[PDB]
Amino acid sequence: AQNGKDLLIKLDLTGSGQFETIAGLRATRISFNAETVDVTSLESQGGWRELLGGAGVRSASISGAGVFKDADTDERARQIFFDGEVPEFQVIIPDFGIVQGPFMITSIDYAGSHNGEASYELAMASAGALSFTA
Amino acid sequence: AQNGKDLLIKLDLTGSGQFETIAGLRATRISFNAETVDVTSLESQGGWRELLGGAGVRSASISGAGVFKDADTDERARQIFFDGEVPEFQVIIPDFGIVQGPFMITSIDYAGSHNGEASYELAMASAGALSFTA
Amino acid sequence: AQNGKDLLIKLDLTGSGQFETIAGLRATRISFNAETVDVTSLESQGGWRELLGGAGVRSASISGAGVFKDADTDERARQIFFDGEVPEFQVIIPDFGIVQGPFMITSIDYAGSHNGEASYELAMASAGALSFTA
Amino acid sequence: AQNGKDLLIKLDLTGSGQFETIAGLRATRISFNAETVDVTSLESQGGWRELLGGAGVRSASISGAGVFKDADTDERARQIFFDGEVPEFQVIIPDFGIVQGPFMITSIDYAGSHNGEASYELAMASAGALSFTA
Amino acid sequence: AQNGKDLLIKLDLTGSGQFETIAGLRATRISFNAETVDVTSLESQGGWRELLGGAGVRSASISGAGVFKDADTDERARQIFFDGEVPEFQVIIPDFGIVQGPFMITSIDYAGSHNGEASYELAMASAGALSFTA
Amino acid sequence: AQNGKDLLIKLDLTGSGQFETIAGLRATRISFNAETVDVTSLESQGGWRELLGGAGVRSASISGAGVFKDADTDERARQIFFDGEVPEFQVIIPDFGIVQGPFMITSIDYAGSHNGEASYELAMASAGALSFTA
Amino acid sequence: AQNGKDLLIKLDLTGSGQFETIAGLRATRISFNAETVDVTSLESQGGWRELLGGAGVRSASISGAGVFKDADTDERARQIFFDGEVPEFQVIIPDFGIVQGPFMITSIDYAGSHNGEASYELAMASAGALSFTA
Amino acid sequence: AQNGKDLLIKLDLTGSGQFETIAGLRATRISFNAETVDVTSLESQGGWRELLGGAGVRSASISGAGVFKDADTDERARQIFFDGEVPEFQVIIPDFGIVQGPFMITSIDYAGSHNGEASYELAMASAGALSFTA
Amino acid sequence: AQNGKDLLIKLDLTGSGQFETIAGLRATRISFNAETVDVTSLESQGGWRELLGGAGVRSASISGAGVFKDADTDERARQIFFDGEVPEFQVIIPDFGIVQGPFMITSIDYAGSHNGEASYELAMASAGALSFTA
Amino acid sequence: AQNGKDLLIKLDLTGSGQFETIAGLRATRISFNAETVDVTSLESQGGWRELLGGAGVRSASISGAGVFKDADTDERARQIFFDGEVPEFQVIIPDFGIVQGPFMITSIDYAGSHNGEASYELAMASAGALSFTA
Amino acid sequence: AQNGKDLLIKLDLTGSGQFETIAGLRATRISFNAETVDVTSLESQGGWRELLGGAGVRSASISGAGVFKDADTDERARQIFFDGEVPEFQVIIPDFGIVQGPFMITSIDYAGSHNGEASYELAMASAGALSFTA
Amino acid sequence: AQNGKDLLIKLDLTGSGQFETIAGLRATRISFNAETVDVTSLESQGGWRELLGGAGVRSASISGAGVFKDADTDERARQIFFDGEVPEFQVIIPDFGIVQGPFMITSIDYAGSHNGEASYELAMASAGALSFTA
């Protein structure tokens, strides 16, 4: 078993190796996807859908949500949306290890309520090759 | 940490620098978006979806909801829908700072109930360049 | 602050100036919309989505629901669906004032239950120019 | 005010004037619709969406649900689905009066549970001209 | 009135007349459908949507869900998905009578939980002519 | 009757016959599908939708969710997403028997919360012929 | 004034008119209920909650408790729970008269103590129309 | 000071002005309620919950209990539950004056014991506008 | 009349017919339940809630409490909670006869005090068909 | 120490500054509440629940009960329920000082018994900003 | 028979085998629970609720209360709440034997009065597998 | 053993280290809580509910009640509710030591009676990290 509060997603401050967790984030998710490229012949020994595997494009989608704690790492998340770039990110699956890919911050949104805290959600998409440091 | 009741979205009364909060607004949200322009080559070192970053169009969507308090700032929100223009707006992320862009008021709607208060929601979309005053 | 039970939507009995509230209506809503006509140049000082404002078509959508009280104003709502015309309607935002536009009654529906009352919903759409009498 | 249990929808037994309520039906609804045919000129005094009114096609949709009581009127609802015809139906809005149009029974469905009763839903669509007897 | 536990859906064991209920099934539904083929003339005495009735294709959709009881009738439901055929099925509306049509088993799915029972859902579609034995 | 905790889905460690359950998985589902290829003639003895049966392509979709227990079988699930291949999988319907087909791991996603455990969902799709060992 | 020991609740022995009191019952109660179907208009001359009256479903709940005296009428109460049916019951309000409705025996429970007598409680619910013979 | 035995609740015998006390009633209570419709702005000078007052629906609940004295006024309480109507009632707060509203009798229940008297409780709910005659 | 100390609830020692009372149990209760499946039509001759009777699921709940006497029958109650099974139980209503159903031991709890004895409560739920041997 | 009979809650007679105690009130209570808005980060130095403080909405609830003494201040409590308004109230904590806020009278109820006095309870809720005069 | 003061619940001092009773504890209770996973088929020979037994999750809940005696075993109960872990506990049912499972201390609370002693309650929940040493 | 009158809960006067007991408080309680985050695998060696321990959020709830003695420490408890902040508090478990955390005062309430003293209750909730000074 493994606790969820050790599944940290990290952002670059200087753009080179200085990885810090964003802010108070309450729910986090890295989501991988494949594209299921259908190769169904005339012969499929009963008509089973045969798949190809290597050919589909693959992606990783980050989804993070939490409370607005105005750390410097949170402002470095805000500004890389503005001069929209694809910096390097790092998700630590808590005892798998490090994901370490570049991601583009597609959607950032700051929400508040009269009776609640200021909360931000944060969604990112894969921008390049992913790795696995362990 | 930071309270949500200091995330104010402001509207122009005279159209030039006179920024006031709209009315009793109970939930507010500024939502940013990118367009994820896919550049996936023949070579992607395993088939990872490569993204471009700078090329996608970017947007900001305001979503505000609250109780109908018939302030002058609320009527100035109503009339700019009618002679539909793109005036300047200002969202204050509570200790980031000022957003300060022009927005078009796409959807305004006044709702009431027999056992409830009169409530308005308010949705706006980006009309131009956004800034960050801090 | 302002109560929701003073947000009355009114219908014409004679088709000329004789405006009455429909029936026992429990929830009412006038909903305005713009069309967000995108004008995004090659140059947008960072790629911000620029909007045009004046060009989009604009609309108003009425949504009313309530209990079936068989007033004469309710039958005048029923018959104008049948010989389908675009009579003049009037929404009173409770201390803004009068909306006063022509609307077509798109959807009317009479619903009942074995353990409930007879209820009608009522949805209308903009048929022409809107005003603001205040 | 008016009770919902007097909003009866009636079916023809002999196909000519012999109208009976279907079965134990617990929720009933007649739903009318118009088609909102858009006529938006170059000139619309501000860009308001102008509508035409008389041109859109109009419809009536019956939605009835209830418990399976195997009356003869319920079997006459079953068989007119099979040799699919458009017999005459009659909805009595409880103190408006009679609707009296022909409807096609589009969807009938008999559902049961291990811990529940046998229930049928019943959806019909307009097949011709509607009337209003009052 | 009529109990829902007498609405049995039956499957063929030998493919010829030997009809048995599947397994422990907790919710069952046979759902019929018509296609509402629109015939709206230039003249429709007010613009009412006129329908044709006999022309639309008609269908029957079975939906069954329940607990996985590994009867022989359940394995005969599994194997007819594999060598995908259209065997004869029988729904008994509890005091209407017998439906008796051929159906193709489109979707079968076996689901389990760590704290629950093993449950299967089962969805079928019409494969031919339907009858009514009563 | 049959317990749900004996519906195990198994993954290959060495790619050849060494089948182990993934991790702590809390909900599991194998979902089969057919394609309902419509063959509706001009003659269908009343207009019943006739189906063909053998012609539609057929598929199996695995859906597994559970807690992140970092077993070696869980890392072997992670890596086969990366060098995306179609290894052999095995679902044991608890007293039917073995499913034993090749599947591609389309979607894997590792999710955590500040107050919850680290959880993974896991969705797979059919990559070839399915069997039934019993 | 009127004594409570003349408020007898009676059960059918043969299912047809042969009504006998159950056993030694020490406390008895017939409880009627309405459903308070809310019809609150936009206008209610001050906002008073207006009710409809005729539309709500109505029920009768029997509650009987007493000592286990193993009469034949007590065993006829036990067996109608097992082959669960809705036989006819009769409550005699002592100088109103007879209630005479069908009731389903929802809850029967036989309780004993080491220092007490064997006691049964008995709760029933309305199964149909109620009457009043007086 | 004021005695409680002069707080009489009265029922209509003929339905028009003929008001009599029910029976031997030992405890009586008229209970009024408001709905506390929350209007809490973004600004509330410290975050105090601001309320609206006029908008909430208001109700009156009668609760009466006593001994079963089989007066004609008690039978007129019984029968108006059966053909469930909303007759006019009258509570006399002993030196305020008269309440005089219509009420629906939601719950009536006749209870007896082997060692006690026959007792009835009686609960009513507001059905319309309330007054105050004094 | 009948004593409560002859209302014995019995447990299986060998799992086959060897029924013994548990321990010193001071209060015992078998509680039966039905599910009151509501079938309320549009017509109910006044709006009486009509019930169905045969369709509701039925259950039996055992509740036993007493002093901890460490008999072998008490340890056989403890262990069947651990390897959680549904063995056969037997309640003897003292001159009705035998209940004889299978029950699952849902809740067992051993409680002690500094000034009291060691006491256990014991709650069971129906696991299958119930009988009545008499 | 301080006596409880000097904790007076006062009502406005003229609506402006004329504050009087209601009637014979036997138990009184002003109850304040906060909303505990949870801000629990990913990091909380051990997982302690961190709170925000300023963001939660705050309220004050009056609860008063006593004997019905028909003073003019008691009738001014009755009538402000009817034309439901939010007048100004004043609680004197006996040597703190004055509370002085506006409150809505949510629940008033007049109760009497055959052997008791006429008693009223009285519950109010916060309608706006609270103060502290001391 | 067996005394309650020999039902000791024991805590680990070193985390490995060194089990001591907590403090002066006046009332203690270990409470076991099952989850009653319902498997009710279409056929249940009369509609009896059939249960599954092996599938439900099972738990053990400790409830201990007593006087605050500041032993070292009491401080070892306090600190394992702070760095919240799941250490091993041991309940000795006095002549059954040893329970010996890991438990998480969910709720600890220290209470005192001006005229009473300092008392602590203590509630724990099952964290893993339970045993039975006897 | 240890007396309850040495379990003092202390409040800050200046907000920095100046800790005093509130007032005459008659009953006091600090209550800790964990969140029992369930991690129940497919395998749990018999189906025991396995828990995670470190992941659940943890809290501390103060409950204090007593007589209104208008000390300066009592007014400092009143005012920190008004400008609602999260000051530092200190509970002294009498020979454990000091708790020393920040708490928000959720509920304060001043109650009085005609024959009793003025009493206040006081409930607080955890606002941050807790400590243990001993």
Author numbering:
A (entry chain B), B (entry chain B), C (entry chain B), D (entry chain B), E (entry chain B), F (entry chain B), ...: 3 to 136
Q: What is the paper's account of this structure, in its own sentences?
A:
The genes encoding proteins that form Rhodobacter capsulatus GTA particles (RcGTA) are derived from phage DNA, which has been integrated into the bacterial genome. Here, we use cryo-electron microscopy (cryo-EM) to determine the structures of RcGTA before and after DNA ejection, and to visualize the interactions of RcGTA with R. capsulatus cells.
The long loop of the tail tube protein mediates interactions between the tail tube proteins from successive discs and between the tail tube protein and distal tail protein.
